[PDB]
Design a protein around this ligand. Sequence first.
Ligand SMILES: CC(=O)N[C@@H]1[C@@H](O)[C@H](O)[C@@H](CO)O[C@H]1O
Ligand SMILES: [Zn+2]
Length: 469
Amino acid sequence: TAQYSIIPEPSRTELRQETAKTLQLLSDQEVPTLETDAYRLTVTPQGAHLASGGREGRIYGLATLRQLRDQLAGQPEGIPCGVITDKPRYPWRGLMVDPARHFIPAADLKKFVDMMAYYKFNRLHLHLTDNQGWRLPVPGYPKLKSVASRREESFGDGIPHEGMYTKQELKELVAYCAARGIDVIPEIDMPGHNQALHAAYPEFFCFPKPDMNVRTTAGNSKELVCPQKPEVWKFYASVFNELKDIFPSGIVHLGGDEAPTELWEKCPLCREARTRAAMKDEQEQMKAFFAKTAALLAKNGQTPQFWYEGNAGIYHPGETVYAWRQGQALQSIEKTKKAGLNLIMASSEYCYLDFPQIQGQRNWGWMKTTTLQKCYDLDPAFGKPEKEAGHIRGVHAPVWAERLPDLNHLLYRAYPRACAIAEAGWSPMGVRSWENFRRKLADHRQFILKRFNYDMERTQGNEPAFRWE
Ligand SMILES: CC(=O)N[C@@H]1[C@@H](O)[C@H](O)[C@@H](CO)O[C@H]1O
Ligand SMILES: [Zn+2]
């Protein structure tokens, strides 16, 4: 029967037995009887009444009101009256874009931000640096622009790809997201994922190779910055100061996935440094490296985030890690609870949106299929109650862009599974069901077509064409 098609599903909906043909905002109050992230929207035959506990809840309420107006535009007979009392299950609901692999122009970022805000996402994670490119401008290091932001091709396509954001563009993005209720989280991978950095500044590395080029294929790089060189730390101080000036969130994602340490083992500087500090192997050196980086961030008033590694030992209680490996989600939950860490659920089994969403679509020889229903199966706590898994801050979906060269491909792979991620991050389990979500997404096809002029229809053969083989 008559109901709302709001994604994510509100925490409480009470429908009433008459129809409203107008959603004109008649009242808009800030009330202390709601949490700062909660709202109450009342639909009456005369219009809508919005109450919110704060600016964040008001932004969420306006998103819900937009979805209601999009529904009303398609139902000339009107939508049901009622009362929506809403607040999120988790305070962290994030998407990650990967401009390092493929640069994303500022206007495409604005469109992406608008779409994710329509679904009450509040975290935007920028994977700014990797082997295939460096997108963060740092004063005093212009080769990052002239070398590390340009690559000759991508997987042998013979087409150069390049791009780097300006400080002004990044501050514009920050203000844009803030106006839409989204905090921006930069990621600067270290000490690895630095082939582009090595192409730009080989003297930062244990074995400088002047012929090093920015990587044009996937895979791992053995090139780690040398922790013994003072210019490395001067450079990272400069990077962190730029991040402090640009991104007010004060959160810096350092990557932190297990790096191959063969070159550290061979490095004469690092060899004598390990001997001098009585370090047994290169994992103690990695611990010392991350301790130094964390001290630097803390002196700047910044806080680190990591891709979780169970037996890394580089973490301090209170810090935040991401669960990402296939089938390690519950183990990561329990390990972080033991170690006093906070956890963000980004498990590749449910949250990696670079994987094909329909079986048979391009998998590039390794990607498994993550359907929309599979995605919606995601419970970030994995059956545990909030009183038992209170250290879980929320959900995070990465859209890795090795094979996503423009916004069209990016949005094709990101949606509509990002809607499922949003509902998993926002809606309590009591109001979640695959049937309701499927109905609502069927309506949201037209909602998105009307509001963003974007086509969310997904068939096996309607994915935009690629240039690779
Ligand atoms: C920390 C880490 O290893 N992240 C990788 C990322 O570099 C890669 O682009 C993606 C491909 O799906 O897989 C992730 O696991
Ligand atoms: Zn070294």
